């Protein structure tokens, strides 16, 4: 049931990156700055980045 934070759609799930800190997602093609591929390491969405210290 994951949708992209930017465009609010869940289509093209092969491009729909999942946050390692929560249930949120983002299409690599909606990401700014440019994200050409799904990263191998952990990715954190902006809501999770806001919880860091």
């Amino acid at each position: 049931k994951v949708t992209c934070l930017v465009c609010r759609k869940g289509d093209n799930d092969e491009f729909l990156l999942l946050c390692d800190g929560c249930d949120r997602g983002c299409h690599i093609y909606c990401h700014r700055p440019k994200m050409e591929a799904v990263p191998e390491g952990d990715w954190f969405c902006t809501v999770c980045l806001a919880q860091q210290v």
Binding site: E14, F15, L18, V38, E40, W43
Partner: peptide, 8 residues
């Protein structure tokens, strides 16, 4: 990281 396709 992983995608919604690779998860399900």
């Amino acid at each position: 990281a992983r995608t919604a396709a690779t998860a399900r």
